[PDB]
Amino acid sequence: MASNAARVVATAKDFDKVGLGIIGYYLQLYAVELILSEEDRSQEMTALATELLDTIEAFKKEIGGESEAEDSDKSLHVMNTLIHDQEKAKIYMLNFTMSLYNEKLKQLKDGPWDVMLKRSLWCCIDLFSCILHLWKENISETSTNSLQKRIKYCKIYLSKLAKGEIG
């Protein structure tokens, strides 16, 4: 819901700290789609939507051209190619999104279970549900079945945490 988007904004900043502007651009697009797909809220929500718009323009200008100072041509190729090519954005997400899920499982096993992990599980599923939902038309009904089963496994761990029990 609207609060779900708020958590994404906080997580979006975390990714910027890692230098994953690619995921930031794709996730920001999901944030606006979430607001429009969200139930109508008081004008306060509209004010937050305007601030998000500033982030979009600020996202492209986030560099300010300072990073371009060196190898400016390379910066445009990476920023322009990944931002303009939607397909390039998805494969980049599968590389990080897929690696993030596997590494996340290791954190649950080697790392302690806390409420913060539960919030990350909801966001991880959102990344897969967002990509699959938009590309759902490009996936076969059976191919989707296999991917949907994978989501159940992720949601399964999430449900066990809700009951307080661990696999």
Binding site: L29, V32, L36, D40, T46, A49, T50, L53, I56
Partner: peptide, 29 residues
């Protein structure tokens, strides 16, 4: 005072939001 109820949304807000949506669609276009 007036039993009549006004719609929660207003036509003016509808057009302003449409302009904002057009900017986002242009961003992806």
């Amino acid at each position: 005072n007036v039993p009549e109820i006004k719609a929660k949304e207003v036509n003016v807000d509808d057009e302003k939001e449409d302009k904002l949506a057009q900017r986002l669609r242009a961003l992806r276009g």
